[PDB]
Structure 1
Amino acid sequence: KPRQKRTATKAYNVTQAFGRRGPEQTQGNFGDQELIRQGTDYKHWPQIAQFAPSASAFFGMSRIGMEVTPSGTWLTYTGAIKLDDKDPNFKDQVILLNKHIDAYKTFP
């Protein structure tokens, strides 16, 4: 499976499918130890997935680029997804996202 189509689960976790969390531009930085170990099996995964873009929104909202480097050809992507301040779970969504963004920095 191409890396972009992989689905993390307890049997193929975030580390196995997408590598260690870290600070380099080539590494992902999202996920506490519980989400890394369980992937889509994570109890709060659906609350995180509501922010993931559809294939249409991924190519409709993102700034797409093509880069040819010594390591190969890359499809770059950047963008921002607005949370809904009126959503009654807004305060829980902020806490949940804060719990996984750069959570690796505190792993024992």
Structure 2
Amino acid sequence: EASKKPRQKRTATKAYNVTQAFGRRGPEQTQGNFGDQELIRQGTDYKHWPQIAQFAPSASAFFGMSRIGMEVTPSGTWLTYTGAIKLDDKDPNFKDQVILLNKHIDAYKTFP
């Protein structure tokens, strides 16, 4: 049901987790590298999800801020995107946001 959406519109939850929705975390260019074991398992049910989601772009900002491309490979036609989002280092929450992001970025490297 949740799995019938195009990948880019899926919402991961406990019932349909980040692995089920977006594949396993890993180093390859086609894989996602973000999330510790708790976030992977809980998705948007993760207790600190709101603090992560604040960094996710609106549809307008995704198409507004990103460098957008199209590539045709053996596997199909792809809309590529890259960009950068500046953290608000003036907010008191800055230091905690850094700790949160650092806990999830490439977290899979330490999994048993």
Normalising by structure 2, we get a TM-score of 0.96
SS in 2 for 1:29: coil
Structure 1 CA distance for aligned equivalents of residues 73 and 23 of structure 2: 21
Q: 1:9-32 CA distances to partner (integer Å, 9 max, x unpaired)? A: 000000000000000000000000
Matches of 2:6 and 2:18, distance apart in 1:
14
Task: Please list every run of 5 or more consecutive structure 1 residues that lacks an aligned counterpart in the other structure.
Answer: none
Deviations 1:67-86 (A, max 9, x none): 01111100000000000110
Q: Determine whether 1:96 maps to 2:89.
A: no
Shift in Å, 1:35: 0.1
For residue 55 of structure 1, report the CA deviation from its aligned partner: 0.1
Tell me how far apart the structure 1 counterparts of residues 95 and 89 of structure 2 sit (CA, whole Å).
9
Unaligned runs of 5+ in 2: none
| Partner deviation per Cα, 1:31-61 (whole Å, 9 max, x = no partner) | 0000000000000000000000000000000
Return the offset for 1:103.
Answer: 0.2
Aligned to 1:46: 50
1:2 is matched with 6
SS at match of 1:7: coil
User: Runs (4+) of structure 1 moved beyond 3 Å?
Assistant: none
Alpha-carbon distance in structure 1 between the residues aligned to 2:100 and 2:26: 19
Q: Look up the match of 1:86.
A: 90
RMSD between aligned residues: 0.3
SS in 1 for 2:25: coil
Q: 1:78 & 1:6 partners in 2: Cα distance?
A: 20
Tell me the SS of whatever aligns to 1:37.
helix
Show the counterpart of 1:58.
62
